[PDB]
Amino acid sequence: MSYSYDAPSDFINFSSKRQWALEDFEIGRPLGKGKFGNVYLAREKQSKFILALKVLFKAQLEKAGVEHQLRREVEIQSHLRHPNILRLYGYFHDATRVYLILEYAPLGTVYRELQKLSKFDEQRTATYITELANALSYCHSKRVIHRDIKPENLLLGSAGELKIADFGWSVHAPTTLCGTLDYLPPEMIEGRMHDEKVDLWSLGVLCYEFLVGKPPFEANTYQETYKRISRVEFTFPDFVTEGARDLISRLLKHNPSQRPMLREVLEHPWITANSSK
Amino acid sequence: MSYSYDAPSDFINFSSKRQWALEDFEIGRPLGKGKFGNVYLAREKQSKFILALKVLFKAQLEKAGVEHQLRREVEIQSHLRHPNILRLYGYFHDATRVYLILEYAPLGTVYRELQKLSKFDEQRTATYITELANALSYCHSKRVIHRDIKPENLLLGSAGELKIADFGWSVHAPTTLCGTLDYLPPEMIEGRMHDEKVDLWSLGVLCYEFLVGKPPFEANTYQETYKRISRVEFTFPDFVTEGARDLISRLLKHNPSQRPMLREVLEHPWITANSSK
Ligand SMILES: Nc1ncnc2c1ncn2[C@@H]1O[C@H](COP(=O)(O)OP(=O)(O)NP(=O)(O)O)[C@@H](O)[C@H]1O
Ligand SMILES: Nc1ncnc2c1ncn2[C@@H]1O[C@H](COP(=O)(O)OP(=O)(O)NP(=O)(O)O)[C@@H](O)[C@H]1O
Ligand SMILES: *SC[C@H](NC(=O)[C@H](O)c1ccc(C(F)(F)F)cc1)C(=O)NCc1ccccn1
Ligand SMILES: *SC[C@H](NC(=O)[C@H](O)c1ccc(C(F)(F)F)cc1)C(=O)NCc1ccccn1
Ligand SMILES: [Mg+2]
Ligand SMILES: [Mg+2]
Ligand SMILES: [Mg+2]
Ligand SMILES: [Mg+2]
């Protein structure tokens, strides 16, 4: 199995050829666990720069058949450079492990913040939505669709700003295929899971959860949650204001082509009235 | 870009580890011109084994941004071994070019055969559909979906056997993603572009085009073709027999889950009444 990715492996001087090596880092406390390894607080020794080192075990990746998914994740995320996207500085590997050198997000996940506060006020919510829409606008400039936006995948920077993480499901979506529609089924012509509008739906779900403290299609079985999503069946508690309802309802369209542009989110009158950014 | 693919580059003794080299091949006449380089008739020098060598220029692949598509195509196709799938024996590369070592299909494309004969009789049609269904059944057993089946991508071996070619749009489609449906849009839960049923629709279009000489949703604009596909709007000429109509109508279903399994195609009584296979 080849661990040669189109992603950087060069040593970086964080006080501003030689490839990364594990001995470049001091390791600190584990930050979390995954199915394939762990994430550690770490520090590059020459600069003393704090970062996160994600360690994945090759045997576990290859047994689960997810090694090409990791390769794509690293290749996509390492070429994104935006203040609301978690940086992937580079990667390296040894006989047993793959290492991802990540930006450290010191304030945790939005998931944990929702556990602590139950729900967010309108200003905190609208500020988060602006940051996310800015990040997703940049992603679309690079023809990247994230496709797995959810509170556990939103980390928090030193200023409390959002950091989109987990590009394990993302795709770069920029032809003889479409030159001829005659043999393509409707789902190949429409390409809905390859549509940037995928991420606009999750933006609506998140705006709802931030304000309400529960996601709009929540149900006690997966099948009922799918029915509610498929039928776009959701309602608002009384306290949700008219502007928030308008934004969320505009985002949660079954047909991806009916969802709004990111500019229309960034300029929505409820966003501009409550966002500090 | 990295040309280290998860695909074989080992020299093969064809008449029954050293890596391929350009000097292993006597390059004969061109077989065709592609977007990024030509395909040549060639023989491996030690064995005199006759094959096709596709030469692609790295500068052109990288300029066009299609090099990860080539990587995926090579990795997928080089691990498929079936008599009705065009073999990709291996690849190699030098400073300027990538080389694909391919099975030579001497008898051209089904697309050309259809141009020459205008339409096929029911025996040839059922035989071809049998071979395609066998090849696609094998693909799906490897969790590979082809997604670009059409007459131009069906080559003919020396006994007239179909060889499925062009895996440039295929996906290997075997999580935390589905662990939480609450944040996913309908199109991400359904995953229709990653459903093996994609290829069953194309098989129905092919069965119709083989018998009729034109595909069922043909229209002189792209928008009208899409509209007819979307509504599954098509008609049968009087000469298409009821048995063929039954099979084609079962395959051409908007809802992919309503399309039959490949075993049902192979076992359809019109197929077995007419196939020589
Ligand atoms: N750069 C980081 N900074 C701070 N905390 C992090 C960072 N990366 C991950 N974490 C935390 O560490 C835990 C482990 O994260 P992680 O395993 O990457 O989740 P994941 O995206 O599902 N990875 P995976 O196991 O491959 O599915 C998570 O719960 C995060 O909250
Ligand atoms: N193994 C083969 N045996 C015989 N003929 C072949 C073979 N591979 C390709 N050809 C023919 O040669 C022509 C050029 O090949 P092809 O690889 O399909 O070009 P292409 O589709 O533009 N490649 P690409 O650059 O990836 O888009 C086609 O019309 C094929 O029919
Ligand atoms: S092929 C017609 C074309 N559709 C796409 O480009 C579609 O999004 C897509 C994307 C990726 C793949 C791949 F993964 F490569 F297989 C396949 C298909 C198109 O013209 N889309 C626009 C459109 C608009 C309205 C209705 C239908 N199509
Ligand atoms: S995520 C829910 C899950 N759906 C799938 O597995 C779907 O086929 C799929 C496949 C691949 C992707 C990926 F490419 F990774 F994005 C995404 C989705 C599921 O629950 N499927 C069963 C189901 C339930 C209800 C309706 C339809 N299907
Ligand atoms: Mg690999
Ligand atoms: Mg991962
Ligand atoms: Mg590459
Ligand atoms: Mg190619």
Side-chain angles (χ1 to χ4, degrees):
Chain A
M1 210 75 181
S2 163
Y3 291 88
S4 161
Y5 309 160
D6 291 315
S9 279
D10 290 3
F11 183 87
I12 290 172
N13 166 29
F14 293 106
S15 304
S16 313
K17 302 110 93 188
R18 176 176 175 183
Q19 306 293 286
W20 291 116
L22 184 58
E23 57 266 21
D24 287 321
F25 303 99
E26 287 192 5
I27 308 304
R29 62 194 172 78
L31 292 168
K33 171 156 268 313
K35 303 137 291 286
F36 309 112
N38 306 276
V39 188
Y40 301 86
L41 194 63
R43 185 195 309 273
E44 192 281 310
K45 284 171 181 180
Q46 291 184 187
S47 67
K48 302 184 183 183
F49 187 75
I50 289 280
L51 40 81
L53 193 68
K54 178 169 189 186
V55 186
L56 306 97
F57 288 90
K58 288 177 174 190
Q60 305 180 205
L61 295 169
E62 298 172 2
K63 174 181 183 145
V66 298
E67 202 276 319
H68 289 164
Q69 178 177 5
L70 175 65
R71 173 175 78 184
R72 181 170 49 251
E73 174 180 0
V74 172
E75 293 179 340
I76 287 172
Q77 188 177 5
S78 66
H79 294 91
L80 299 179
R81 302 284 265 275
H82 189 275
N84 303 111
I85 297 176
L86 194 75
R87 273 281 276 145
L88 177 51
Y89 293 110
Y91 88 106
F92 58 104
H93 60 105
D94 63 20
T96 57
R97 287 145 299 197
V98 184
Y99 304 85
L100 309 197
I101 305 164
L102 296 155
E103 169 177 14
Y104 179 55
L107 266 50
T109 64
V110 174
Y111 179 88
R112 169 74 242 177
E113 202 76 13
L114 282 162
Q115 285 182 321
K116 172 183 138 229
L117 300 164
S118 200
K119 58 178 170 292
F120 301 150
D121 62 54
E122 294 195 291
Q123 289 70 224
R124 186 181 181 116
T125 296
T127 300
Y128 280 161
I129 294 296
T130 292
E131 295 163 4
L132 194 45
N134 285 336
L136 294 168
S137 180
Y138 171 83
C139 282
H140 300 3
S141 78
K142 305 296 179 195
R143 300 307 187 249
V144 169
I145 311 167
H146 183 286
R147 309 198 301 181
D148 194 28
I149 299 284
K150 63 188 170 187
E152 311 93 283
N153 285 345
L154 305 175
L155 285 163
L156 293 170
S158 63
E161 78 276 29
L162 288 194
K163 304 274 175 176
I164 295 183
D166 192 359
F167 284 79
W169 309 94
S170 65
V171 286
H172 182 249
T175 38
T176 59
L177 177 74
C178 302
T180 311
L181 305 182
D182 279 295
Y183 308 90
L184 299 178
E187 67 270 16
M188 283 303 289
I189 298 172
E190 294 174 0
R192 293 196 179 191
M193 57 196 302
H194 265 250
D195 196 305
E196 63 179 20
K197 293 288 169 84
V198 161
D199 293 326
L200 276 289
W201 172 283
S202 60
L203 201 46
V205 181
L206 282 172
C207 192
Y208 184 104
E209 171 152 14
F210 292 169
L211 298 170
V212 171
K214 0 161 55 176
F217 307 109
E218 178 168 62
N220 60 8
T221 66
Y222 297 11
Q223 309 93 282
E224 185 61 26
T225 297
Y226 168 65
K227 290 308 196 206
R228 294 177 187 176
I229 292 169
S230 181
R231 296 168 179 172
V232 195
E233 286 175 344
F234 68 96
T235 58
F236 300 99
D238 294 333
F239 62 82
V240 178
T241 67
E242 172 181 17
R245 296 177 189 234
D246 179 79
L247 176 58
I248 290 166
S249 293
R250 273 154 69 167
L251 292 163
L252 301 178
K253 308 300 287 192
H254 186 278
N255 175 5
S257 71
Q258 296 180 1
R259 301 173 198 155
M261 300 287 280
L262 287 168
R263 183 92 252 123
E264 299 174 304
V265 177
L266 286 159
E267 293 173 357
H268 191 282
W270 183 83
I271 288 299
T272 60
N274 296 98
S275 182
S276 46
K277 195 275 163 192
Chain B
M1 300 296 279
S2 163
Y3 292 87
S4 294
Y5 302 166
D6 292 321
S9 290
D10 314 293
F11 181 92
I12 292 164
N13 181 97
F14 283 111
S15 49
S16 309
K17 295 160 159 77
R18 175 184 175 179
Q19 309 287 283
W20 296 113
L22 180 54
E23 290 66 37
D24 286 325
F25 301 93
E26 317 202 304
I27 315 306
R29 62 188 191 88
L31 291 174
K33 187 230 84 152
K35 199 149 157 268
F36 304 101
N38 299 170
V39 183
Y40 299 88
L41 191 65
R43 68 158 25 92
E44 191 279 311
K45 288 178 176 173
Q46 294 186 179
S47 62
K48 300 320 180 196
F49 183 72
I50 295 181
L51 42 81
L53 196 69
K54 178 169 186 175
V55 186
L56 305 104
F57 289 87
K58 298 185 169 177
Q60 302 182 28
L61 301 163
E62 302 180 8
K63 181 176 172 58
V66 294
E67 198 278 323
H68 286 164
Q69 177 174 12
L70 179 61
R71 178 174 68 183
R72 175 169 48 256
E73 170 184 2
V74 171
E75 294 178 338
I76 287 172
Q77 189 176 2
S78 70
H79 291 85
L80 300 174
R81 301 212 47 239
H82 187 278
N84 297 113
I85 302 177
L86 195 75
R87 273 262 262 156
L88 176 53
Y89 300 102
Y91 88 104
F92 63 102
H93 62 106
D94 56 27
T96 61
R97 282 119 73 202
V98 185
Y99 302 85
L100 270 42
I101 304 163
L102 287 156
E103 170 175 14
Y104 172 49
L107 292 190
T109 66
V110 173
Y111 174 95
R112 174 190 169 100
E113 193 186 18
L114 269 172
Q115 286 179 315
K116 298 296 268 184
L117 300 181
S118 296
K119 50 194 135 183
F120 299 157
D121 64 27
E122 291 188 305
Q123 290 64 226
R124 174 161 287 158
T125 296
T127 301
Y128 284 3
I129 294 296
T130 295
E131 293 164 31
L132 289 177
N134 283 333
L136 290 170
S137 184
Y138 171 84
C139 283
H140 296 180
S141 82
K142 306 296 189 188
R143 300 325 183 200
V144 168
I145 317 167
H146 182 287
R147 311 195 305 177
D148 194 24
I149 297 287
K150 58 187 173 185
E152 284 127 70
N153 288 339
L154 306 180
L155 308 188
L156 291 175
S158 53
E161 57 275 64
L162 260 52
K163 304 279 177 171
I164 291 176
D166 190 359
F167 286 78
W169 310 96
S170 61
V171 284
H172 174 64
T175 60
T176 66
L177 174 76
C178 307
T180 315
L181 303 182
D182 274 301
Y183 308 89
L184 297 175
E187 64 271 19
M188 286 297 298
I189 300 179
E190 295 171 357
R192 294 196 161 182
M193 304 174 71
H194 281 234
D195 194 317
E196 59 184 24
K197 296 297 199 190
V198 165
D199 288 332
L200 276 288
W201 171 285
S202 306
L203 198 53
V205 179
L206 283 181
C207 192
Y208 184 107
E209 159 133 33
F210 291 167
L211 294 171
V212 171
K214 52 196 200 160
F217 309 106
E218 185 173 76
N220 60 8
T221 68
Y222 278 80
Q223 298 86 344
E224 185 64 16
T225 303
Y226 168 63
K227 179 165 131 48
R228 299 189 48 203
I229 288 164
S230 185
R231 310 156 87 78
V232 195
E233 205 189 338
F234 74 99
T235 61
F236 290 110
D238 282 351
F239 62 83
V240 179
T241 67
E242 291 304 312
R245 299 182 181 206
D246 176 65
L247 173 61
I248 290 163
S249 294
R250 250 215 105 337
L251 288 164
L252 296 178
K253 293 292 179 66
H254 192 282
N255 187 343
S257 69
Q258 294 176 5
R259 301 176 200 152
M261 295 292 286
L262 287 166
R263 182 192 43 92
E264 299 173 72
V265 175
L266 290 156
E267 294 171 351
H268 194 280
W270 178 83
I271 292 285
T272 56
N274 291 111
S275 73
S276 70
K277 276 180 83 282

